[PDB]
Amino acid sequence: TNTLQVKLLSKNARMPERNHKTDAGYDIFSAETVVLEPQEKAVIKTDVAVSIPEGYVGLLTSRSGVSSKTHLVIETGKIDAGYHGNLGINIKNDHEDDKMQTIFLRNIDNEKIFEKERHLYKLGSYRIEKGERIAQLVIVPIWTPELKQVEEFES
Amino acid sequence: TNTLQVKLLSKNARMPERNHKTDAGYDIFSAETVVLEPQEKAVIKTDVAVSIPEGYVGLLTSRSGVSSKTHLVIETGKIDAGYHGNLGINIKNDHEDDKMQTIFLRNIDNEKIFEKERHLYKLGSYRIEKGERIAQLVIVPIWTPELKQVEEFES
Amino acid sequence: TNTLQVKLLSKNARMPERNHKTDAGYDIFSAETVVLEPQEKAVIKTDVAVSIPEGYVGLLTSRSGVSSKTHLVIETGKIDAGYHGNLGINIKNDHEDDKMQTIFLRNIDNEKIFEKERHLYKLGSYRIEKGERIAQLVIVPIWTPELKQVEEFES
Ligand code: NI
Ligand code: NI
Ligand code: NI
Ligand code: NI
B113 contacts B107 by C-beta, under 8 angstroms: yes
Interface of A with B (CB under 8 A): 39, 41, 43, 54, 56-57, 75-83, 88, 90, 92, 94, 96-97, 140-154
Q: Are B122 and B101 in contact (CB under 8 A)?
A: yes
Known binding residues of A for Mg(2+) are 94
CA distances from A139 to A77, A78, A111, A145, C140 (A): 12, 10, 31, 19, 10
DSSP reduced 3-state for B67: helix
CA A42 to chain centre: 11
C25–B148 C-beta distance less than 8 A: no
Residue B140's beta-bridge partner residues? Answer: B57
Residues in chain A: 155
| Angstrom distances, CA of residue A134 to CA of A9, A19, A29, C38 | 18, 16, 6, 25
**Strand B5-8, strand A148-149: pairing:** parallel
Domain hosting B106: range is 1-155
Q: Which of B106, B80, B79, B84 is nearest to B95 (CA)?
A: B106
- CA C112 / ligand 4 centre spacing (Å): 17
- Give the count of Cβ contacts less than 8 A between chain A and B: 95
DSSP codes of every residue in chain A? ----EEEE-STT----B--SSS--SEEEE-SS-EEE-TT-EEEEE--EEE-PPTTEEEEEEE-HHHHHHSSEEE--EEE-TT--S--EEEEEE-S-----EES-EE-TTS-EE--SS---EETT-EEE-TT-EEEEEEEEE---PPPEE-SS---
B22: how many CB neighbours lie within 10 A of its CB? 15
- The alpha carbon of A119 and the centre of ligand 1 are apart by a number of angstroms equal to 10
Which of A75, A77, A148 is opposite residue B6, by nearest beta carbon? A148
Mutate which of C11, C23, C134 to disrupt the B interface (most B C-beta within 10 Å)?
C23
Distance between CA atoms of B66 and B74, rounded to whole angstroms? 10
Question: With contact defined as beta carbons under 8 Å apart, do C108 and C132 qualify?
Answer: yes
Contact between C28 and C135 under an 8 Å Cβ cutoff? The reply is yes
Which DSSP category does C35 fall into?
E
Count Cα neighbours of B72 within 13 Å in the Cβ-side half-sphere.
30
Residues contacting B115, CB < 8 A, separation 6+: B103, B105
Cα dihedral across residues C35, C40, C42, C44: positive or negative: positive
Solved with: X-ray
Shortest CB distance from B80 goes to which of C23, C98, C141? C23
Of B88, B90, B147, Cβ closest to residue C6: B147
What is the CA(B27)–ligand 3 centre distance, in A?
Answer: 26
Are the beta carbons of C56 and C116 closer than 8 angstroms?
no
For chain C, list residues whose CB is within 8 angstroms of any CB belonging to chain B: 1-8, 15-16, 18, 20-26, 49, 51, 56, 61-62, 64, 67-68, 71, 73, 76, 84, 94, 96, 98, 136, 138-141
The C-alpha atoms of residue C79 and residue C58 are separated, in whole angstroms, by: 5
Quickly count: other Cβ atoms within 10 Å of residue A87's Cβ. Answer: 25
Q: Give the domain CATH number at C69.
A: 2.70.40.10
Q: Which of A74, A80, A90 is nearest to A49 (CA)?
A: A80
Q: Is-cis flag, bond preceding C2, omega within 30?
A: yes
Chain-centroid distance of CA C58 in Å reads 12
Ramachandran quadrant class, A39 (left: phi over 0; alpha: psi -120 to 50; beta: rest): left
Q: Residue C103 has what DSSP assignment?
A: S
- A8 alpha carbon to ligand 3 midpoint, in Å? 34
Number of alpha carbons in the 13 Å side-chain half-sphere of residue B56? 23
CA atoms within 13 A on the CB side of C118: 3
Q: Is A32 exposed, middle or buried (0-12, 13-18, 19+ CB in 10 A)?
A: middle
| Final resolution, Å | 2.9
The structural domain count of chain B equals 1
C25 annotated to a ligand binding site: no
Confirm or deny that B94 is annotated as ligand binding. yes
Chain B, nearest residue to A87 by Cα: B64
Pairing of strands B26-29, A88-93: unpaired
Closest CA to C99 of C41, C42, C40, C38: C38
Backbone phi and psi for residue A71, each to the nearest 5 degrees, phi listed first: -85, 10
CA of C18 to the centre of ligand 4 (A): 35
Distance CA A149, CA A138 (A): 32
Please name which of B2, B6, B58 lies closest in space to residue A152, comparing C-alpha atoms: B6
Strands (E) located in chain C: 5-8, 26-29, 34-36, 41-45, 48-50, 56-62, 72-74, 77-79, 88-93, 101-102, 105-106, 112-113, 121-122, 126-128, 133-141, 148-149
User: How is residue B11 annotated by DSSP?
Assistant: T
- Residue B91 and residue C2: Cα distance in Å, rounded? 36
Q: Do A153 and B2 touch (CB under 8 A)?
A: no
Decide if B138 contacts B52 (C-beta within 8 A).
no
Residues 6+ apart with CB under 8 A from B102: B120, B121, B122, B123
